Design a protein around this ligand. Structure first.
Ligand SMILES: Nc1ncnc2c1ncn2[C@@H]1O[C@H](COP(=O)(O)OP(=O)(O)OP(=O)(O)OP(=O)(O)OC[C@H]2O[C@@H](n3cnc4c(N)ncnc43)[C@H](O)[C@@H]2O)[C@@H](O)[C@H]1O
Ligand SMILES: Nc1ccn([C@@H]2O[C@H](COP(=O)(O)CP(=O)(O)OP(=O)(O)O)[C@@H](O)[C@H]2O)c(=O)n1
Ligand SMILES: [Mg+2]
Ligand SMILES: [Mg+2]
Ligand SMILES: [Mg+2]
Ligand SMILES: [Mg+2]
Ligand SMILES: [Zn+2]
Lengths: 158, 263, 94, 1091, 81, 41, 104, 45, 11
DNA sequence: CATATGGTTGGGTATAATGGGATTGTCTCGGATGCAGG
DNA sequence: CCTGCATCCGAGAGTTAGGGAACCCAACCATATG
C-alpha cells in the first residue's frame, strides 16, 4: 500500500462535466440579458448549477474507482473505513468546489481545480477565508462545549 | 511575608488591604478624639467603609483598589474564594499529586492489551520508596538512608538495583492519563514493562479511547499506592476490562488504521 | 485481561463488592505474611527472577487466585470484627 | 551539484530587505546621524518639540544628541547589561521679566540601541519588539446597528491622545454628540464655534429636514461665551461654572495640541474623506481668544449627505486594510518617550513653583528619572517586547516580521470577535492568509507578506506593474488598499510575449472580486505569486497542491527546526533560501573584492583592494535564547580571491549560503509492522551511524554567593561530609574544571552556608541533564561594568554542552505539515532496500496523506527520486514551477541511468521483479504486452519501484513510492520533557506539590480526572489522590514511613486545603462548623485554634 | 416546574457543591443567612472534604463486606456453639 | 527594597502567579520526618 | 467522631471576638532591621503564635515539654509553630461597617 | 460498558454527563475542510 | 454617587 | 542587676497661597426595574 | 389600579504543559556591654 501522484486518478468525464457547465452558464447569462432573471434568481441558479456539478463529479470519481481501479489506495482506504471520506477524495481527484466569502455568501466562480492539478493563487486565497473561519470556529466553540459538560456534571453528580 | 532565596521579600495583597484598614481606623479614632468638624469625620467614615468593602470584595463597587505604580487590582478574599483560579476549583476539586510523571508517547505494537512501556528512570523515580525497601531487603544497601544516598547520584547506580526495581513492580499497575479527559476512558490502568529510553509505549488499540496519536502527544503516569487502590485499578480500570463504550454499548477497543487495511 | 476475571465478575452481584473483598483479602494476607492462605503448596502464585522461582510478593494476585479456588466465604454481617481479628491473630501469631 | 530551475515568470524587482520594518522605523525614530538643524518633526524630536517650551520662567528645548554606547554588544551580553546610548538635551532658561538666559546641556539617561539584525539587548537578553496592528485614526461613518437607515459618525484620535467623539441623528431629529459618555446637543457646540443661522442654513439646507431638526433658536440666542459656559455645565456637572475654567477645559478637550492629537495618518485620512485642508491636527483652533471649527462642520456635511443618499458618500469597512495601520518599534518607543517627557515636564513645573525664580538652572529643574523609568518599562514589561526566538535564523527573521493585534491598547485574546480574526479581502499581498497560530491566538498574530512595505503613515503597501494599452511596463507602483481598490489588477500568471498580454481573456481582481476582462481594461498586474505569502510560507515547494491547514502547520514548524552539524539544503527548493540566509545576518560575506589572507576556526582575515587588512572574528559555540548552539564555520582558503558579496563563513543551519534546516533522506511510503501507526515514524540506524540529525545544545547554570545575617556565603572547594570522589572535577576555586563530564548528582560549583557550623548549598546537575562543561564565567563585586543586586557578593555561571543524536521520542517534520515522533530505530539489514542493495532511511505511513490532503510531499518525493538518480537539485517556485510532465521527463532520464547502469554490469530482471510486475499488471498499473523493462520504466515514471523486504528477502507485493524527502528535527525533544517525582517541594499556603518540571513538581489531577475516577467508582484511589498524595501532611508522612517500612499506607485525614478554606471563610465573618451525627461540633483543627 | 441545568444546579440543597460550581458569593450569602446544613450526599462535597465518595467501592451497599477462610469460620462457629 | 506581591501575574494568560513558584521551607518533608522517626526508633 | 455535616452561619461580633487571640492595633508587619514581627502588628507572635517550634520570641523557653506556657517576658505561648496558620485575630472598628456581600 | 445489569453503587450521573459532553467537544457544528444548529441547539435545549 | 473625590469636593 | 550608647520618636518652621485626573474593538442571557399605555 | 416593554446590571465564557519627590532639633525608651 502506497500513495503516488498518479494514484489520485482523474476521471475523464469531469472534462465533459466542465464544458457542459461553461455552456449552461452562458445561457443563464442570456437569461440575464433579456430581463427574465433578477439578481437573486441568477445567483441562486448559478449556485445550484455548481452544486449539482460537484455532486455529479463526486459520483463520477467513485464510479471510476469502483469500475476501473478497484484496488486504488485512496478507494481502498475509504471503502475499508481506514481513512478518508468521499469529500476529501473528491477534492484530491475531482474538484475543490464552491467557496464562501468572509461575509458568509458563496462566490460566483468555483474552484475547478483539484489538489492533484494544483490550485491557482486566487483560488488558494479564496479558500483561505473558509480555512480561517473553521479554525476560529473550533477555538471559540470548544469552550462552550466544555462549559456545557461542566454544567451537566454539577447537575447530575449526585 | 516570605524571603525569596535572593533575600528579597514577597507578600500577599491581603497584607496591604489590612494595612489600609488599620491606618484608616486609627486615623478615624484620632479624629474622633479631637472633636473634628462633621465634614472631616464624614469623609473618614466613608473612607473606612470603602476600605472594608475593598478588603472583603475588591472591584465590586467603584474603582478597584490598586497598588501605586500598577494597574493591577488587589486580590480580595472573594477573589481568593471564587473563580476558575479560586480556592474551590483550583485546590479542592483538583490537586497536584505526588508519585506522578509525564512523558512523550510512542506506539507499542508488541505490547499486550494490558501492558504499557514505562521508562526505567521514570519507574525508578516513581517507585522510589518501594525500591528503597526492597534494596534494604536485599544486600544492595545496609539501610534506607544509604540506599537513598546511592540512588541520588546517577554514577553511583549499579546493575542489581534494576533487578530490585523489576521485583518491586511485579503485578502492580499504573494509571495513564491524556489531557483533555473527556470521558472516563481518558484514564486507564496498565501493567508496566520496564523499557530503555525516555518514551512511554502505548498499545495501538487504546489510542482511539484516549484520542491519542504520535506527533508529539504527552501522557501522565500516576501510581496507586495501597492495596485498595491497586485492587480498584486492576479490577475496575484495567484496559483489558474496558472494551465496550459506556455511552453507546459499542466496542471501543477495536481494529483501526493499519489493522483494518491489512485485514 | 486478568485470569478468570469473568468467573469473578459472575461470582458477585456487584463488581465493587468483588473489589472490596479482594482488597480486604490482600490486606489480610499482607498482615499475616501469607501464612493464612487457602492455596495448596503447588497452586501458589510464582514469580521468576534470576535466582529462581519464588513466591509472588503481590498480595492482590494471591487474593484473586484464592477467590478463584472458591474456598473463601464472603458476605454482609458474617462475623464480628473483634472476633475475626482475635481468632485470626491467635491461629497465626504475628 | 547542478541546480535546475523551473518557472516562466520573471521578477522585475527583487525582494526588499526583509528586516526593514524594524530597522527603518527605529532609524527614523532616532535620527541619530542627522544634524540637529536638519532634523524633521518625527520621532523623539517631535516629542521634544511638543512638550517644550515649558511655559509657567520659560524652559525651552534647543537640540538633542546621542552619545556612544558605554559597552559594546558582546560585553552587554556577558555582564547582563542593556546595549544603550546616552541622550543629552541642550536647554535654555529664560526669565520673562529680566531677559537673562541660562543655557545648559543636561544628561537625560539612556536609550536602547537596535542591533544590525533588528533586535535589542535588554539586561543581556536578546529581545524583539513586535509591530502592532490597530484602527487608524480619522473619521469613520458606520451604519447604525439597531435603527436602520441611520448612520453614526466617529472621530478617533491616536490612542491615549484624545476622547472618541460620536455624532448621531436622534429619533426626534436633532443631531447629538457623545463625548466622554455624555450625550448633548451638537448645535450648542457649533454655536461655541461661532456659527450663525445663515451659515448653517446656507451650508446644510441642500439635504432636507435634517438641517431644520438641528436648527434651534434657544441656543442661537445665547452668545458664544454663554454657550461655552452651558457646554461646561452639561459636560462637567457640579464644577462651579467659571469662564476661565470652562475655556481651559474645552480647549484641552478638542483644541489643545498637547492633549488632542490626530496624528499624521488621522490627518491624511480625514483630509481625503472630507476633502478639506487641516492646517494642524486638532479638531478646532483657539485664535484671537476664540474657537475656530476645523472638522466638525465637514463631518456634519458628510453625515447629512450620506443620510440623504447623495452619490459619492459611503460607509467605512472597519476591517479594510486602508482603515487599519501598523505601529512599529519606533512609534511605540516614541509614544513611551513622550509619556516620560510629559512626566518630566510636570516635575519641571512643580520645581519651578516650589523653588526660587532668582537662582534657577536647567539642571535643577529637570529630573530625568521618569523618562528612564518609562523607557525601562517599555523595553522590559511591554507584551510586545518579547524574548527573541532564535532556534534558527529563520525563527528570528520570522519573529521580526510578526504583527500582533494584542498589547497595550490592543485587543484581548478573549475579547476578539470573528471580524478581526478573519482573512479580509484586502489582506491580499499585505498579510499572509496562511501563517498564524493554531490555538486561541488564531487571527490575532499574523505575518507581513514577502513583498509588502509599511509606509510612513503606517499602511501596508503592495507592488504592482503598470499596464498601458495591453502592454506590461517595468514601472512598479506600491499601493495602499484604498488606492488598490480603484483599479483592475490582472493575475501574475497571465501569458506574455515580450511584455504584451497575449491572451484574449484575462483573470483579474476588481475590488477583490474575481472577474474576466480584456487586456485593454487591465491597469495593473501582480509582481509575483510570492507576494501573496510570507517568508516562511514561501519556503514550501508545491504549495499549490497542499491544503491550507497543513501548509499552516508546515510553515509554523519550519521555525522550530534545530541546526544540525551536517545540515543540508533541500533537494527541492523554492529559490528563496539564499535571501533568507543573507538577510538574517547569520552568514559572513566579503564587504569588497579582495583576497583571503588568514583562515581559522575562529577568525578570517581578508585583504581588500584598498590595501586594508580586515579581521572578522567567528561566533563559535554560542548559546541561543533556546539553548541551541550557533556557530560560524569558514568556507574559504588562504590565497583565494573573493568578489563582493561572496560567502566567507556559513552560519547555523546554512549550507554554502543556502538555508539548511534538515537532511535529505531516502523515504518509502508504506506501512511497516505497526511501528509507523498513527503518524509514527520508522528510521534506519544508518542515519545515526553517519551522524545525521545530530545537534548541539548548551545549558547555562547559575549560582550566587551573597551576604547573610549569619555571615557571608563562600564559593569554595572546602566542603564537609563528602569523600574526595565527589570533588575530583572541582578546581581550587570550588568550580568544576573545563572539559569535565558531569552527570546528575555531580557538583558544578561548591558552596557552603552558615547553618545557624556550615552546611552544603552547592550547585548540582539536575536530573536528566549533564554533558561536557565548556565554559565558566565569574562576576564579582567591583568589577568594571558589573552591577550585582545589593547583598550578592558574586555570581558564577557554567555553560555545559550536549551532543544529542536522534532517539525514540524525537519529533521530525517535513515542509508540508507531515509531523511525527520517531517510534522505532531499525538495523540496516531490516530496512526495505532497492534491488541494487541500497536501503531506505525513513518509512512513512500512507494513511497520513488522504485526510490531510497535502499532496505536495508526494510530488516532492517523486522529484527527489529523479534528483537522487540524476545527481542534481531543483528550484520549483510556488504556483509557477515544476509540473507533472517535466517530472515525468526527469524520471525517464533517471530510469535510463538507473537501469542502463544495471544492464552494463550484466544483470537482467530479477524473478521477484517479474512477480511484482505480474501483480502490477493485475493491479492495472502497467499495460499488458510490453517487455519487463518497459513495465519497470512505466512504474518508475509513476514514482514507484520494486522494493525488497530486508527481513525475508521477498519483495513487497506491490510497487512502493520511494524518493528523497527533506526532513527536519524539531526543538520538541523527549530529553527535555521526561519528568517524574516521588516527593519534593510543597506550596506555602495550600501545602500541595509544586508545578512544573523545573520545580521538580507534580502532575495536576484536575476536575475532569476526578470525574473519570468517580465514573470508575474507584473511591479509594480518589481518596489517595486527594489526601495521601497532595496535602494531608500527617497522612503523607505516615504513608512514606509505612512504604519504606514495608507496611501498607494508613487511612487519610482532612486535607489542608479544607482547613485553608475554613480559615478564609472565617475571615469573611462566616461561621463554618463540622458536625457529627448528633449535630455536635467536631474540631478538625485538633485543638490548635481553641482558646 | 422546568428549569435549565444551571438554575437546577444552583438551586440544590447542598451549599458546598453550589458554592464550588458558580455564583459563589450569592450561594454563600444565602446559605449563611439561612444557616444551611450540608448533609454530604453527593460526590463533590465528599471530594471537597477529602472523604470516601458514596459510590463504587465506597457505597454502603458493598463497603461493609467481610471475607474469611473456612478454618477461621469453623473456629468461630465452635466458639459460638 | 520593597516587597513584591505573591499575586504578581506571570505570563499573558490569567493563570500563573508569582507565589506559585515559591516552595515551603518550614514544614518538614516526608523524607525528613521518616528519618527522624526511624532515628527515634 | 466522623464528620457528617457542615453548617455555615452568620458570625456575631461576640463570635468573632471569641475567635481572635488578640487585636491587631498597628499596621506594622516586620521589623526592618531584624526581620521579626512587630508587637501588635499583622504578624505578632503574641497573637498568632511562635515562628519556631516550642520557642518563645526572646528565647527564655527554647525546648519542648512546656506546652501551654505563656512567656512572662514576651507573651508567646510555647506550642507547635503550625498554629500560625490556624489562629485568627481581629480589628475593632471605631464605627460599624456593612458587610458588602449583604449590600451589593 | 459490560452488556450486563448495572451494579449497585455505580455513579451513573457522572457517566451520563461525560457521555453527553464527549462528542460535542469535537463532532459538532475536528478540522473543517473548506470545500464545495448543532451544539447551540443542544445548549438551548 | 461614586467617586468619593467628587463628593468630598462638593461638600 | 546597672548603666551608656544610638536608635527611635515627638515637635517645629509665620509674605501668601483656597474644588482632581482618567476615560474607548464582545456576546449572550436572566432577573430587577422604571415608564408607557390601557 | 393593572399590564407589557424596553433598560440596566451582573455573571459566565474547556483541559494539560511552560512561564518569572524637606530639613532640623531635642527628649526617651531599647538594647548592649560589665
Ligand atoms: N491546547 C491544547 N490542549 C491540549 N493538548 C494539546 C493542546 N495543543 C496541543 N496539544 C497536544 O499536543 C500535541 C502536539 O501538538 P503539535 O501541534 O504537534 O505541537 P504543539 O505542542 O501544539 O506546538 P507547536 O509549536 O507545533 O504549535 P504552534 O507553533 O502552532 O503554536 C505554539 C503554541 O502551542 C501552544 N501549546 C503547545 N503545547 C500546548 C499544550 N500542551 N496546551 C496548550 N497549548 C499548547 C502554546 O501556547 C504555543 O504558543 C497535540 O497533538 C495534542 O496531543
Ligand atoms: N486547543 C486544543 C487543541 C487540541 N486539543 C486536543 O489535541 C488534539 C489534537 O488533534 P489534531 O487537531 O491533531 C486532530 P486529531 O484528533 O488527531 O484528528 P484526525 O486524526 O481525525 O485528523 C485534539 O483532538 C484534542 O484532543 C485540545 O484539547 N485543545
Ligand atoms: Mg490524529
Ligand atoms: Mg497529537
Ligand atoms: Mg499547536
Ligand atoms: Mg496553566
Ligand atoms: Zn520569652
Amino acid at each position: 500500500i502506497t500513495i503516488g501522484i498518479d494514484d489520485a486518478v482523474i476521471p475523464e468525464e469531469k472534462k465533459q462535466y466542465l464544458e457542459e457547465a461553461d455552456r449552461k452558464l452562458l445561457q443563464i447569462e442570456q437569461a440575464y440579458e433579456m430581463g427574465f432573471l433578477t439578481d437573486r434568481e441568477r445567483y441562486d441558479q448559478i449556485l445550484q448549477l455548481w452544486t449539482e456539478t460537484t455532486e455529479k463529479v463526486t459520483q463520477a470519481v467513485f464510479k471510476n474507482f469502483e469500475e476501473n481501479y478497484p484496488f486504488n489506495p485512496l478507494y481502498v482506504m475509504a471503502q475499508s473505513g481506514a481513512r478518508g471520506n468521499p469529500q476529501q477524495i473528491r477534492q484530491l481527484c475531482g474538484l475543490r468546489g464552491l467557496m464562501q466569502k468572509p461575509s458568509g455568501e458563496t462566490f460566483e466562480v468555483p474552484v475547478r481545480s483539484s489538489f492533484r492539478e494544483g490550485l491557482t493563487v486566487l483560488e488558494y486565497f479564496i479558500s483561505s477565508h473558509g480555512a480561517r473561519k473553521g479554525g476560529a470556529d473550533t477555538a471559540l466553540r470548544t469552550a462552550d462545549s466544555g462549559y456545557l459538560t461542566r454544567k451537566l456534571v454539577d447537575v447530575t453528580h449526585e | 511575608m516570605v524571603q525569596v532565596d535572593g533575600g528579597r521579600f514577597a507578600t500577599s495583597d491581603l497584607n496591604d488591604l489590612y494595612r489600609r484598614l488599620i491606618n484608616r481606623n486609627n486615623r478615624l479614632k484620632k479624629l474622633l478624639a479631637q472633636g473634628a468638624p462633621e465634614i472631616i469625620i464624614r469623609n473618614e467614615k466613608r473612607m473606612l467603609q470603602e476600605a472594608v468593602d475593598a478588603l472583603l470584595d475588591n472591584g465590586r463597587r467603584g474603582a478597584p483598589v490598586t497598588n501605586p505604580g500598577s494597574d493591577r487590582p488587589l486580590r480580595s478574599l472573594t477573589d481568593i474564594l471564587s473563580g476558575k483560579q479560586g480556592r474551590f476549583r483550583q485546590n479542592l476539586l483538583g490537586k497536584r499529586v505526588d508519585y506522578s510523571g509525564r512523558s512523550v508517547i510512542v506506539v507499542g505494537p508488541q505490547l499486550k492489551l494490558h501492558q504499557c512501556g514505562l521508562p526505567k528512570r521514570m519507574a525508578l523515580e516513581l517507585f522510589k520508596p518501594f525500591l528503597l525497601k526492597k534494596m534494604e531487603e536485599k544486600g544492595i544497601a545496609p539501610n534506607v538512608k544509604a540506599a537513598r544516598r546511592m540512588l541520588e547520584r546517577q554514577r553511583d547506580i549499579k546493575d542489581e538495583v534494576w533487578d530490585a526495581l523489576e521485583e518491586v513492580i511485579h503485578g502492580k499497575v499504573v494509571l495513564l492519563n491524556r489531557a483533555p479527559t473527556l470521558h472516563r476512558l481518558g484514564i486507564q490502568a496498565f501493567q508496566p514493562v520496564l523499557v530503555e529510553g525516555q518514551s512511554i509505549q502505548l498499545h495501538p488499540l487504546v489510542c482511539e479511547a484516549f484520542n491519542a496519536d504520535f506527533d508529539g502527544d504527552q501522557m501522565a503516569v500516576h501510581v496507586p499506592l495501597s492495596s485498595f487502590a491497586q485492587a480498584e485499578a486492576r479490577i475496575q480500570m484495567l484496559s483489558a476490562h474496558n472494551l465496550l463504550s459506556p455511552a453507546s454499548g459499542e466496542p471501543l477497543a477495536k481494529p483501526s488504521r493499519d489493522i483494518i487495511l491489512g485485514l | 485481561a486478568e485470569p478468570g476475571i469473568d468467573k469473578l465478575f459472575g461470582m458477585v452481584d456487584s463488581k465493587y463488592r468483588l473489589t472490596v473483598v479482594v482488597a480486604k483479602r490482600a490486606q489480610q494476607l499482607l498482615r499475616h505474611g501469607f501464612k493464612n492462605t487457602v492455596l495448596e503448596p503447588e497452586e501458589r502464585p510464582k514469580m521468576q527472577t534470576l535466582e529462581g522461582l519464588f513466591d509472588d510478593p503481590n498480595a492482590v494476585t494471591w487474593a484473586m487466585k484464592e477467590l478463584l479456588t472458591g474456598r473463601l466465604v464472603f458476605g454482609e454481617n458474617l462475623v464480628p470484627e473483634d472476633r475475626l481479628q482475635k481468632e485470626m491473630e491467635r491461629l497465626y501469631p504475628v | 551539484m547542478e541546480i535546475k530551475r523551473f518557472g516562466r515568470i520573471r521578477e522585475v524587482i527583487p525582494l526588499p530587505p526583509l528586516t526593514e520594518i524594524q530597522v527603518e522605523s527605529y532609524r527614523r525614530a532616532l535620527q541619530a546621524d542627522v544634524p540637529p538643524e536638519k532634523r524633521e518633526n518625527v520621532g523623539i524630536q517631535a516629542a521634544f518639540r511638543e512638550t517644550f517650551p515649558i511655559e509657567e520662567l520659560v524652559l525651552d528645548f534647543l537640540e538633542y544628541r546621542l552619545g556612544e554606547p558605554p559597552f559594546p554588544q558582546d560585553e552587554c551580553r556577558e555582564k547582563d547589561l542593556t546595549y544603550q546610548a546616552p541622550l543629552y538635551a541642550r536647554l535654555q532658561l529664560i526669565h520673562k521679566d529680566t531677559g537673562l538666559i541660562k543655557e545648559d546641556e543636561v544628561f537625560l539617561g539612556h536609550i536602547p540601541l537596535m542591533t544590525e539584525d533588528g533586535s535589542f539587548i535588554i539586561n543581556g537578553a536578546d529581545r524583539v519588539i513586535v509591530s502592532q496592528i490597530h484602527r487608524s485614526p480619522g473619521v469613520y461613518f458606520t451604519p447604525d446597528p439597531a435603527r436602520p437607515g441611520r448612520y453614526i459618525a466617529s472621530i478617533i484620535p491616536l490612542p491615549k491622545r484624545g476622547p472618541w467623539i460620536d455624532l448621531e441623528v436622534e429619533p426626534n431629529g436633532v443631531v447629538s454628540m457623545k463625548v466622554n459618555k455624555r450625550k448633548f446637543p451638537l448645535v450648542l457646540l457649533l454655536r461655541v464655534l461661532g456659527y450663525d443661522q445663515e451659515t448653517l442654513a446656507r451650508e446644510l439646507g441642500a439635504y432636507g429636514e435634517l438641517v431644520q431638526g438641528l436648527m434651534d433658536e434657544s441656543v442661537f440666542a445665547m452668545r458664544p461665551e454663554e454657550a461655552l459656559i452651558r457646554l461646561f455645565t452639561l459636560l462637567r456637572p457640579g464644577d462651579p461654572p467659571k469662564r476661565d475654567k470652562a475655556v481651559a477645559y474645552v480647549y484641552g478637550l478638542i483644541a489643545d495640541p498637547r492633549r488632542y492629537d490626530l496624528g499624521e495618518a488621522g490627518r491624511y485620512k480625514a483630509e481625503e474623506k472630507l476633502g478639506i485642508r487641516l492646517s494642524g491636527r486638532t479638531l478646532a483652533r483657539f485664535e484671537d481668544g476664540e474657537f475656530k471649527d476645523e472638522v466638525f462642520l465637514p463631518t456634519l456635511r458628510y453625515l447629512f449627505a450620506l443620510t440623504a443618499g447623495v452619490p459619492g458618500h459611503e460607509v467605512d469597512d472597519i476591517d479594510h486594510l486602508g482603515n487599519r495601520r501598523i505601529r512599529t518599534v519606533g512609534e511605540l518607543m516614541t509614544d513611551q518617550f513622550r509619556v516620560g517627557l510629559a512626566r518630566l515636564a510636570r516635575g519641571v513645573r512643580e520645581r519651578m513653583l516650589m523653588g526660587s525664580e532668582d537662582s534657577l538652572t536647567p539642571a535643577k529643574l529637570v529630573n530625568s528619572r521618569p523618562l528612564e523609568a518609562a523607557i525601562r518599562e517599555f523595553f522590559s514589561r511591554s507584551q510586545l517586547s518579547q524574548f527573541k526566538d532564535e532556534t534558527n535564523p529563520l525563527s528570528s527573521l520570522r519573529h521580526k516580521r510578526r504583527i500582533s493585534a494584542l498589547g497595550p491598547g490592543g485587543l484581548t485574546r478573549e475579547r476578539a470577535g470573528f471580524d478581526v480574526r478573519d482573512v479580509h479581502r484586502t489582506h491580499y499581498g499585505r498579510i499572509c492568509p496562511v501563517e498564524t497560530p493554531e490555538g486561541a491566538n488564531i487571527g490575532l498574530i499574523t505575518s507581513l507578506a514577502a513583498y509588502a512595505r509599511v509606509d510612513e503613515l503606517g499602511f501596508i503597501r503592495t507592488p504592482y506593474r503598470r499596464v498601458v494599452g495591453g502592454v506590461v511596463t517595468d514601472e512598479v507602483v506600491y499601493m495602499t488598499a484604498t488606492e488598490e481598490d480603484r483599479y483592475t489588477i490582472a493575475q501574475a500568471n497571465t501569458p506574455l510575449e515580450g511584455n504584451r498580454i497575449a491572451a484574449e481573456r484575462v483573470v483579474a481582481r476588481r475590488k477583490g472580486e474575481p472577474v474576466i476582462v480584456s487586456p485593454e481594461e487591465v491597469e495593473f498586474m501582480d509582481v509575483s505569486p510570492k507576494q501573496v505569502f510570507s517568508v516562511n510560507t514561501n519556503l514550501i515547494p508545491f504549495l499549490e497542491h497542499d491544503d491550507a491547514n497543513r501548509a499552516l502547520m508546515g510553515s509554523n514548524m519550519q521555525t522550530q527546526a534545530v541546526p544540525l552539524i551536517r545540515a543540508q539544503a533541500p533537494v527541492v527548493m523554492t529559490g528563496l533560501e539564499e535571501r533568507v540566509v543573507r538577510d538574517s545576518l547569520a552568514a559572513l560575506y566579503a564587504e569588497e573584492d579582495g583576497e583571503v589572507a588568514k583562515v581559522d576556526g575562529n577568525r578570517i582575515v581578508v585583504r581588500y583592494e584598498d590595501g586594508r587588512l580586515v579581521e572578522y572574528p567567528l561566533r563559535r559555540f554560542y548559546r541561543s535564547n533556546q539553548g541551541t548552539a550557533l556557530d560560524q564555520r569558514p568556507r574559504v582558503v588562504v590565497g583565494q580571491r573573493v568578489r563582493k558579496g561572496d560567502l566567507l563563513a556559513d552560519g547555523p543551519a546554512s549550507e554554502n549560503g543556502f538555508l539548511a534546516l534538515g537532511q535529505n533522506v531516502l523515504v518509502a511510503i508504506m506501512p511497516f509492522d505497526g511501528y509507523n501507526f498513527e503518524d509514527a515514524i520508522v528510521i534506519s540506524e544508518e542515519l545515526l551511524k553517519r551522524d545525521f540529525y545530530t545537534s548541539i545544545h548548551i545549558e547555562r547554570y547559575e549560582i550566587e554567593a551573597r551576604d547573610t545575617k549569619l555571615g557571608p556565603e563562600r564559593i569554595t572547594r572546602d566542603i564537609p561530609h563528602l569523600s574526595e570522589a565527589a570533588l575530583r572535577d572541582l578546581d581550587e576555586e570550588g568550580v568544576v574544571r573545563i572539559g569535565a563530564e558531569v552527570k546528575p548528582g555531580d557538583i558544578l560549583v561548591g558552596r557552603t552556608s552558615f547553618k545557624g557550623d556550615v552546611k552544603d548549598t552547592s550547585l548540582r546537575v539536575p536530573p536528566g541533564e549533564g554533558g561536557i562543561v565548556v565554559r565558566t564565567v565569574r562576576l564579582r563585586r567591583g568589577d568594571p561594568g558589573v552591577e550585582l543586586k545589593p547583598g550578592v557578593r558574586e555570581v558564577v555561571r557554567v555553560y555545559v554542552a550536549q551532543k544529542r543524536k536522534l532517539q525514540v521520542g524525537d519529533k521530525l517534520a517535513n515542509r508540508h505539515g507531515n509531523k511525527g515522533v520517531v517510534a522505532k530505530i531499525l538495523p540496516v539489514e531490516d530496512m526495505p532496500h532497492l534491488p541494487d542493495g541500497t536501503p531506505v532511511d525513513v518509512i512513512l505511513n500512507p494513511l497520513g496523506v488522504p485526510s490531510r490532503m497535502n499532496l505536495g510531499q508526494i510530488l516532492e518525493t517523486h522529484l527527489g527520486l529523479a534528483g537522487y538518480f540524476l545527481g542534481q537539485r531543483y528550484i520549483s517556485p510556488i504556483f509557477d514551477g515544476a509540473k507533472e510532465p517535466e517530472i515525468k521527463e526527469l524520471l525517464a532520464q533517471a530510469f535510463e541511468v538507473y537501469f542502463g547502469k544495471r544492464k552494463g554490469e550484466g544483470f537482467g530482471v530479477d524473478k521477484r521483479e517479474v512477480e511484482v510486475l505480474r501483480r502490477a499488471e493485475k493491479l492495472g498499473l502497467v499495460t499488458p504486452g510490453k517487455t519487463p523493462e518497459e513495465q519497470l520504466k512505466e512504474l518508475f515514471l509513476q514514482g514507484k519501484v520494486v522494493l525488497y523486504d530486508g527481513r525475508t528477502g521477498e519483495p513487497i507485493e506491490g510497487p512502493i513510492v520511494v524518493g528523497q524527502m527533506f526532513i527536519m528535527k524539531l526543538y520538541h525533544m523527549v530529553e527535555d520533557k521526561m519528568h517524574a517525582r516521588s516527593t519534593g517541594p510543597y506550596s506555602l499556603i495550600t501545602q500541595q506539590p509544586l508545578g512544573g518540571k523545573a520545580q521538580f513538581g507534580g502532575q495536576r489531577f484536575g476536575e475532569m480526572e476526578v470525574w473519570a475516577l468517580e465514573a470508575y467508582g474507584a473511591a479509594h484511589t480518589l481518596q489517595e489522590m486527594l489526601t495521601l498524595k497532595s496535602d494531608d501532611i500527617e497522612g503523607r508522612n505516615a504513608a512514606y514511613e509505612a512504604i519504606i517500612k514495608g507496611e501498607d499506607v494508613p487511612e487519610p485525614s482532612v486535607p489542608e486545603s479544607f482547613r485553608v478554606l475554613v480559615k478564609e471563610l472565617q475571615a469573611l465573618a462566616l461561621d463554618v462548623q463540622t458536625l457529627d451525627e448528633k449535630d455536635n461540633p467536631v474540631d478538625i483543627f485538633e485543638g490548635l485554634a481553641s482558646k | 416546574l422546568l428549569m435549565g441545568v444551571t438554575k437546577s444546579a444552583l438551586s440544590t440543597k447542598s451549599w458546598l457543591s453550589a458554592a464550588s460550581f458558580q455564583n459563589t458569593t450569592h450561594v454563600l450569602t444565602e446559605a449563611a443567612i439561612a444557616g444551611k446544613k450540608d448533609e454530604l450526599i453527593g460526590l463533590k462535597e465528599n471530594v471537597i472534604l477529602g472523604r470516601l465518595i458514596p459510590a463504587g467501592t465506597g457505597s454502603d451497599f458493598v463497603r461493609f463486606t467481610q471475607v474469611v477462610d473456612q478454618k477461621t469460620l469453623k473456629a468461630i462457629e465452635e466458639a459460638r456453639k | 527594597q520593597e516587597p513584591v506581591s505573591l499575586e504578581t501575574p506571570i505570563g499573558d494568560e490569567k493563570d500563573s502567579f508569582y507565589g506559585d513558584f515559591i516552595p515551603d521551607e518550614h514544614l518538614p518533608s516526608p523524607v525528613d520526618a521518616a528519618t527522624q522517626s526511624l532515628l527515634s526508633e | 467522631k466522623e464528620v457528617r455535616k457542615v453548617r455555615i452561619a452568620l458570625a456575631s461580633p461576640e463570635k468573632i471576638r471569641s475567635w481572635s487571640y488578640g487585636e491587631v492595633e498597628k499596621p506594622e508587619t516586620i521589623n526592618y532591621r531584624t526581620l521579626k514581627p512587630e508587637r501588635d502588628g499583622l504578624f505578632d507572635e503574641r497573637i498568632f503564635g511562635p515562628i519556631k517550634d516550642y520557642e518563645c520570641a526572646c528565647g527564655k523557653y527554647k525546648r519542648q515539654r512546656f506546652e501551654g506556657k505563656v512567656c512572662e517576658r514576651c507573651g508567646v505561648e510555647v506550642t507547635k509553630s503550625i498554629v500560625r496558620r490556624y489562629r485568627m485575630g481581629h480589628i475593632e472598628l471605631a464605627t460599624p461597617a456593612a458587610h458588602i456581600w449583604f449590600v451589593k | 460498558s459490560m452488556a450486563r445489569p448495572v451494579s449497585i453503587g455505580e455513579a451513573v450521573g457522572i457517566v451520563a454527563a461525560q457521555s453527553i459532553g464527549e462528542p460535542g467537544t469535537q463532532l459538532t457544528m475536528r478540522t473543517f475542510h473548506t470545500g464545495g444548529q448543532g451544539l447551540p441547539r443542544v445548549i438551548e435545549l | 454617587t461614586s467617586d468619593p473625590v467628587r463628593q468630598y469636593l462638593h461638600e
